[PDB]
C-alpha cells in the first residue's frame, strides 16, 4: 500500500543499491560479463551498460528513477551511462547510515550534498588540463579514443575527418554584448544532421556547408553552377488559377473550348512570369509544378526543384536567406540566395539529389555518407556518432580530465580537505560524497583483478601527498601516471557525471513516503 | 480490529455504530492527513504517487497528493473533496486544511470518550470559529511599509534567493519593489490593483549588475538613424504616432523590376513614388505628431520631411511594445492607413498624448523613452550583469520576483503567516474558553489546541525541534495578549512567527511572511465543516 518515513528511505536506497550492483562490472576496458536470463528460453551476454539496465525489469519506483538518470545522461553526453548509476548508488549508500544511525533529517542531508557538488565541480576543473581544440592532429588523437577496439578502427582517419569538420562548422562560436553569448553551444543532433546516400565507400564521404535535399527536379539537364545565385521559396503550386467564388461557364460552340484551353495556359504562365520577373536561378516549390510551368520556368534560365516540404524550405532559407512566400504572385525581388557554390542535381546511387553547398556557415551543416550498401552506410553512421559525441564534448570545453579513477580520487581527497573545515551537522553527509566518489577507482581495481583495499589505499596516498594524475592501469592493475598512460576524458562528461549523480540521489533521499492511488 | 460481525439489525449488510464507527472515522482522517502532512511549508518534503499501471510522479502539491490518494473510507474522502473545493475558492491551503481537520476530529474523539456529547462538540467548535474569525479581523492589516521604510524588499529577496541575481539582491530588490509601488493603479470601477503585465524588461552587457536602470516609462528599442534631431523633444507636450504600416516610397510591385532607358522617365517615376508615400507623411505632420513610432521603418525622404518640420521620425520600432505605448498614450496602433480613396490619421485621431520623449543611450542599447502618458501605470527595467547567461536568468528572476510581490500586494487585506494566526488564535481561544463555565469551553479549549498542529508541522518540516519553537512562539503571542487591554508595553510581541530556515522566532511582518486574510478565514471554516460532517456519523450500514 504505502511505505512511510524510514520505510521510504530504506526502500529507495535499497533499490538504488541493487541497480548499482547490476552494472559494477561494466566499468573499464576489462568489464566483466553478466548473464541476462529472459522469461523465454534465451539468454543474453551483452555487457553494454545501457542494454543491461534496459533489458532487466525493475520493481521499485526508485530503481526506475535510477534508469531515468542513465537515460538523461545518454541524451546529455555520449558517455557516463554507468558512472552516474554507480556513483549515485554509492552516494545513497553512504547517506544511508546518516539517515538511520545518526538520525540526520533529510533536509540536512540534501543541503550538504548540494555543497559537496559545488566543491566537487571545482576540483574536476582544477585537475584538468587544456588541449588546443584548433589543432586538428591533436583532435584526431582524442576522437580515436572512441573509435579503437572496434572493427571500424581502420576507418578512424575518415571518421575523425567527418566528425571534426562537421562539429566545428555548427559550433556557435560567438560572443558580444548585443546578440548574446552562445558560449560555444553545440547541438549535433539538429545541426550536424547526417544523410546516407548509396554508392561509393567510406572514403568518399564529405561534410557539406548547406542543405542536402533528397527531392528530384523538373528536368535532369539544368545548370549546376551559378555565378549570381538567386533562390525562390514558394508553397503554392503552379497550376490553373481558379476563383474563390462561384463561376458558371456554358459552352455551346465547340470552337470556344480552345479559348478555355488558351486561358488555362495563360494562368499558369502568369504565375511563372511573377517568378521569372525577379530573375531567379533556382525555384523551390513545396507543391507540384505543372508540365507547362516546368517549361515556362526552365526556358527563363533557372532551375526548378519540386516537392520540398516547409521543413526543408526552412533549412534552405537559413543557408540561402530566401524568404518563404505562400502565394506565387506575391514573390518579392528581395528573395536571394547568392554566394552559393552549386545547385548540383547529380544522380547518386540511381537516386536524384539537390545540393545547395555554399561558402557560408549559418550555424549548421550536413554530413553526406557514402557506402556500397545500406549495411555499410549504417555501419559508418552508427560508429560515426561516437566520434561526433566526443568531438562535441571536447570542442564544448578545451579541458580534459584524467581517467583511470584519477579525477574521482582527486575529488575524494580534496573534499576531505574541505570537510575538515566544514562546521556543523552537515559535516557528516558532506563526507558521504567524498567517500562515494571512490567507487570508480575501487571498481576499476576489482575488474582489473587487484586488491580493492591495498591498491586503493596506495592510490589515495599518492593523491594525498603527490599529484592528481595518478590512476589505475586498466590492463596491468598497477598504479600508473595518467600522462604516461593517456586515458583522458573530456571535462564535460566528468562535470555532468557528478552533477546528475548527486542530484538524482537528492531526488530519492528527499522522498519520505510512497503512496498508491490513481 | 476491523468492525464486523454486527449480529444485529437484520438487513443485507453490516452495522457499525457508536465508538466503533467513531474510532474508524478517526483512523481514516489520520490516514489521509499522514500523507499530505509533510508537504506543509516551503521547507517541506515531496512525496511519490504511484498508479496501478507502473508509472509515478513526485510532487509536494497538496491538491495533487490528496486527489491521487487511494482512500477506502468515505470519512477520508470528505477531506479530499474538501481540498478539491478549496482549490475552487482559494487555490491554496489544501495541505493546512486537511492537517487541521484531522487534528480536530482526533481531539473530538477524546471529548466523546470523556462524555461530551458530539452535539456539544459540534456546537462548541462553531462557537470557537465565530470568535476565531473575529480575532483574525483584529490582526488584519493592509498594504503597509512603503513610506519611510520597505519590508516588501524581503519578499523580492526571498523570490530571488534561488536565482543567479540573488547575489545582488541587496541592490536589485529595491528595483523590484519600487517598480511595482510606482505603478499602483486602478483597472476599473475603483478596484485599486497593481498592474499584472507592467514593467518591460531589456538587457545589455555593458556594466556590472548594480548599474541596472529603472526608467519611469516605456523604453522602446528603436532609433531615429540621424543626428539631425535633438535627443530631447516636446518640452511642453508630445503627440505620438504608434504605426505599423511603413512610410517607404511606393513600389509598382514587389515582383516587378523597373527597367528604364531614358533617365528622364526614371526620375519621374521616383518622384511619383515619393509623392504617393508623402501622403502618409503629410497627414502625420498635419495631425501634429511630434514623435512618429513606425514599426516597419521610415524612408529617408520621409524622415527629411519630418526633420524639417521639427518632428522626430523613429525607425524600426517594436510592434509588441507599441501596443502598450499606444494604449498608455490614448493612441491607436495603426495596422494600415486608409479613409476612402486616400490615407490619413484623421486629425490626431490615431495619435496619443504624453509629456516628454527623450532618446537615451544605454551603453550598447538604444531606445526612445515615452514618459508621462495620459495613463501608463508601467515602467521599464534595463538589466545588466556578469554575462549574457546571467542577463537571461536575471530577466526570469525579475519576472518571478515581480509576480511574488504583486501576489502579496494583490490582496489589500493580509495577515502574518508562519503560525502567527494559528498560535495567536491558540492564546485567544484558550482565554475565550474561560468565559463559558459550562460545556462548550471543553470543545473550545480543544479547538485552540488543535490549531497548534500547523506551527508544529512547519517546525518538523524545517528539521527543527517543534517543541521549543512552538513553546517560544506561543510565549510571544501570550505576551501580546497580556498588554492588549492596556496598550502598555515595551514591545507588542505581536505577529512573531517561525523562521523555518534559521530556526528562531522572528517578526513576520518585517520578514515578509504574509498570507491573505481570506486564506485563514476559509481554511478554519473549511476544516470545521468537514469535521462536523464526519462527527455527525454515528452509524454506517454496509450492504
In words, what does this structure look like?
- It is classed as chaperone.
- Keywords: TRiC/CCT, phosducin-like protein, chaperone.
- The entry is titled "yeast TRiC-plp2-substrate complex at S2 ATP binding state".
- This is part of a larger assembly, with chains A (518 residues) and B (543 residues).
- By secondary structure, chain A is an alpha/beta fold.
- Chain A has a domain at 210-357.
- Chain A has 17 helices and 18 strands.
- In chain A, the strands form 7 sheets. Chain A has a 4-stranded parallel sheet with strand order 10-9-8-11, sandwiched between helices.
- In chain A, strand 8, helix 9 and strand 9 form a beta-alpha-beta unit.
- Chain A starts with a strand and ends with a strand.
- Chain B has 543 residues and is of the alpha+beta class.
- Chain B has a domain at 217-410: GroEL, CATH 3.50.7.
- Chain B is built from 17 helices and 18 strands.
- Chain B has helices spanning 19-36, 62-67, 74-89, 94-113, 118-139, 152-159, 169-181, 263-286, 300-308, 319-329, 388-410, 420-433, 440-451, 453-461, 466-482, 508-511, 517-535; strands at 14-17, 47-50, 56-59, 200-203, 213-215, 218-221, 232-233, 238-243, 291-294, 312-314, 352-361, 366-373, 380-383, 414-416, 496-499, 504-507, 514-516, 539-542.
- In chain B, strands 6, 7, 8, 9, 10, 11 and 12 form a 7-stranded mixed sheet that branches.
- In chain B, strand 2 and strand 3 form a beta hairpin.
- Chain B is elongated, with a radius of gyration of 33 Å.
- The two termini of chain B are 20 Å apart.
- Classes of the chains: A alpha/beta (518), B alpha+beta (543).
- Strand 18 (513-516) of chain A pairs parallel with strand 2 (47-50) of chain B, so a sheet runs across the interface.
In brief:
This is part of a larger assembly, with chains A (about 525 residues) and B (about 550 residues). Chain A has about 525 residues and is α/β, with parallel strands linked by helices. Chain A has helices at about 5-25, 50-55, 60-75, 80-100, 105-125, 135-145, 155-170, 190, 255-275, 290-300, 310-320, 375-395, 405-420, 425-435, 440-450, 455-465, 490-510, and strands at about 1-5, 35, 45, 130, 195-200, 205-210, 210-215, 230-235, 280-285, 305, 325, 355, 365-370, 400, 470, 480, 490, 515.
Amino acid at each position: 500500500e504505502r511505505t512511510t518515513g524510514r520505510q521510504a528511505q530504506i526502500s529507495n536506497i535499497t533499490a538504488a543499491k541493487a541497480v548499482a550492483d547490476v552494472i559494477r562490472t561494466c566499468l573499464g576496458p576489462k568489464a566483466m560479463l553478466k548473464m541476462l536470463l529472459d522469461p523465454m528460453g534465451g539468454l543474453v551476454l551483452t555487457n553494454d551498460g545501457h542494454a543491461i539496465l534496459r533489458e532487466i525489469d525493475v520493481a521499485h519506483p526508485a530503481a526506475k528513477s535510477m534508469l531515468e538518470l542513465s537515460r538523461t545522461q545518454d541524451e546529455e553526453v555520449g558517455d557516463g551511462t554507468t558512472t552516474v548509476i554507480i556513483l549515485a548508488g554509492e552516494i545513497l549508500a553512504q547517506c544511508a547510515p546518516y539517515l538511520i544511525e545518526k538520525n540526520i533529517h533529510p533536509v540536512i542531508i540534501i543541503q550538504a550534498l548540494k555543497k559537496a557538488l559545488t566543491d566537487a565541480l571545482e576540483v574536476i576543473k582544477q585537475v584538468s588540463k587544456p588541449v588546443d581544440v584548433e589543432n586538428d592532429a591533436a583532435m584526431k588523437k582524442l576522437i580515436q579514443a572512441s573509435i579503437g577496439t572496434k572493427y571500424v578502427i581502420h576507418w578512424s582517419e575518415k571518421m575523425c575527418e567527418l566528425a571534426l569538420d562537421a562539429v566545428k562548422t555548427v559550433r556557435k562560436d560567438l560572443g558580444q554584448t548585443v546578440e548574446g553569448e552562445p558560449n560555444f553551444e553545440i547541438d549535433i543532433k539538429r545541426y550536424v544532421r547526417v544523410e546516407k546516400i548509396p554508392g561509393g565507400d567510406v572514403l568518399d564521404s564529405r561534410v557539406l556547408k548547406g542543405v542536402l535535399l533528397n527531392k528530384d527536379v523538373v528536368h535532369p539537364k539544368m545548370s549546376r553552377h551559378i555565378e549570381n545565385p538567386r533562390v525562390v521559396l514558394l508553397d503554392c503550386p503552379l497550376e490553373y488559377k481558379k476563383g474563390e467564388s462561384q463561376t458558371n461557364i456554358e459552352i455551346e460552340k465547340e470552337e470556344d473550348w480552345n479559348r478555355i484551353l488558351q486561358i488555362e495556359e495563360e494562368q499558369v504562365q502568369l504565375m511563372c512570369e511573377q517568378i521569372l520577373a525577379v530573375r531567379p536561378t533556382l525555384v523551390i516549390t513545396e507543391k507540384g509544378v505543372s508540365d507547362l510551368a516546368q517549361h515556362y520556368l526552365l526556358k527563363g534560365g533557372c532551375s526548378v526543384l519540386r516537392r520540398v516540404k516547409k521543413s526543408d524550405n526552412n533549412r534552405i532559407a537559413r543557408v540561402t536567406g530566401a524568404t518563404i512566400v505562400n502565394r506565387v504572385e506575391d514573390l518579392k525581388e528581395s528573395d536571394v540566395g547568392t554566394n552559393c557554390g552549386l545547385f548540383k542535381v547529380e544522380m547518386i546511387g540511381d537516386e536524384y539529389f539537390s545540393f545547395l553547398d555554399n561558402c557560408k556557415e549559418p550555424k549548421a551543416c550536413t554530413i553526406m555518407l557514402r557506402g556500397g550498401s545500406k549495411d555499410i552506410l549504417n555501419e559508418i553512421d552508427r560508429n560515426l556518432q561516437d566520434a561526433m559525441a566526443v568531438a562535441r564534448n571536447v570542442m564544448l570545453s578545451p579541458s580534459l580530465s584524467p581517467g583511470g579513477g584519477a579525477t574521482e580520487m582527486a575529488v575524494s581527497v580534496k573534499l576531505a580537505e574541505k570537510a575538515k573545515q566544514l562546521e556543523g551537522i552537515q559535516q557528516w553527509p558532506y563526507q558521504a560524497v567524498a567517500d562515494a566518489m571512490e567507487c570508480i577507482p575501487r571498481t576499476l581495481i576489482q575488474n582489473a583483478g587487484g586488491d580493492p583495499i591495498r591498491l586503493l589505499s596506495q592510490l589515495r596516498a599518492k593523491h594525498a601527498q603527490g599529484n592528481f594524475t595518478t590512476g589505475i592501469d586498466g590492463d596491468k592493475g598497477k598504479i600508473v601516471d595518467m600522462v604516461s598512460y593517456g586515458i583522458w576524458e573530456p571535462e564535460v562528461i566528468k562535470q555532468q557525471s557528478v552533477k546528475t549523480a548527486i542530484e538524482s540521489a537528492c531526488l530519492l533521499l528527499r522522498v519520505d513516503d510512497i503512496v498508491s492511488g490513481v | 480490529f476491523n468492525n464486523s460481525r454486527s449480529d444485529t439489525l437484520f438487513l443485507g449488510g453490516e452495522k457499525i455504530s457508536g465508538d466503533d464507527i467513531r474510532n474508524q472515522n478517526v483512523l481514516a482522517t489520520m490516514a489521509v492527513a499522514n500523507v499530505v502532512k509533510s508537504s506543509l511549508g516551503p521547507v517541506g518534503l515531496d512525496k511519490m504517487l504511484v498508479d496501478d499501471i507502473g508509472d509515478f510522479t513526485v510532487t509536494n502539491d497538496g491538491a495533487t497528493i490528496l486527489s491521487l490518494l487511494d482512500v477506502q473510507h468515505p470519512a477520508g474522502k470528505i477531506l479530499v473533496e474538501l481540498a478539491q473545493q478549496q482549490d475552487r475558492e482559494i487555490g491554496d491551503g489544501t495541505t493546512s486544511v486537511v492537517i487541521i481537520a484531522s487534528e480536530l476530529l482526533k481531539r473530538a474523539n477524546e471529548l466523546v470518550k470523556n462524555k461530551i456529547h458530539p452535539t456539544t462538540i459540534i456546537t462548541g467548535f462553531r462557537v470557537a470559529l465565530r470568535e476565531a474569525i473575529r480575532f483574525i479581523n483584529e490582526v488584519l492589516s493592509t498594504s503597509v511599509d512603503t513610506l519611510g521604510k520597505e519590508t516588501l524588499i524581503n519578499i523580492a529577496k526571498t523570490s530571488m534567493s534561488s536565482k543567479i541575481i540573488g547575489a545582488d539582491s541587496d541592490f536589485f530588490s529595491n528595483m523590484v519593489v519600487d517598480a511595482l509601488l510606482a505603478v499602483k493603479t486602478q483597472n476599473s470601477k475603483g478596484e485599486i490593483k497593481y498592474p499584472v503585465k507592467a514593467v518591460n524588461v531589456l538587457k545589455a552587457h555593458g556594466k556590472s549588475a548594480t548599474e541596472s536602470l529603472l526608467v519611469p516609462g516605456y523604453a522602446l528599442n528603436c532609433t531615429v538613424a540621424s543626428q539631425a534631431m535633438p535627443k530631447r523633444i516636446a518640452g511642453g507636450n508630445v503627440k505620438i504616432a504608434c504605426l505599423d504600416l511603413n512610410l517607404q516610397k511606393a513600389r509598382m510591385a514587389m515582383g516587378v523590376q523597373i527597367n528604364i532607358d531614358d533617365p528622364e522617365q526614371l526620375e519621374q517615376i521616383r518622384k511619383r513614388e515619393a509623392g504617393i508615400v508623402l501622403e502618409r507623411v503629410k497627414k502625420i505632420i498635419d495631425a501634429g505628431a511630434q514623435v512618429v513610432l513606425t514599426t516597419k521603418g521610415i524612408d529617408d525622404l520621409c524622415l527629411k520631411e519630418f526633420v524639417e518640420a521639427k518632428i522626430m521620425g523613429v525607425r524600426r520600432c517594436k510592434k509588441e511594445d507599441l501596443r502598450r505605448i499606444a494604449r498608455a498614450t490614448g493612441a491607436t496602433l495603426v495596422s494600415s492607413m486608409s479613409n476612402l480613396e486616400g490615407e490619413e490619421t484623421f486629425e490626431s485621431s490615431y495619435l496619443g498624448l504624453c509629456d516628454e520623449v527623450v532618446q537615451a543611450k544605454f551603453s550598447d542599447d538604444e531606445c526612445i523613452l515615452i514618459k508621462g502618458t495620459s495613463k501608463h501605470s508601467s515602467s521599464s527595467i534595463i538589466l545588466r550583469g556578469a554575462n549574457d547567461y546571467s542577463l537571461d536568468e536575471m530577466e526570469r528572476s525579475l519576472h518571478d520576483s515581480l509576480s511574488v510581490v504583486k501576489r502579496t500586494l494583490e490582496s489589500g487585506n493580509v495577515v502574518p503567516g508562519g503560525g502567527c494566526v494559528e498560535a495567536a488564535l491558540n492564546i485567544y481561544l484558550d482565554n475565550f474558553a474561560t468565559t463559558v463555565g459550562s460545556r462548550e469551553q471543553l470543545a473550545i479549549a480543544e479547538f485552540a489546541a488543535a490549531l497548534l498542529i500547523i506551527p508544529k508541522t512547519l517546525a518538523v518540516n524545517a528539521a527543527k525541534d517543534s517543541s521549543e519553537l512552538v513553546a517560544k512562539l506561543r510565549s510571544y503571542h501570550a505576551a501580546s495578549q497580556m498588554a492588549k487591554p492596556e496598550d502598555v508595553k515595551r514591545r507588542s510581541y505581536r505577529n512573531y512567527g517561525l523562521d523555518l530556515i534559521r530556526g528562531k522566532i522572528v517578526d513576520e511582518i518585517h520578514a515578509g511572511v504574509l498570507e491573505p486574510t481570506i486564506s485563514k478565514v476559509k481554511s478554519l471554516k473549511s476544516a470545521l465543516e468537514a469535521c462536523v460532517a464526519i462527527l455527525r456519523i454515528d452509524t454506517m450500514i454496509t450492504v
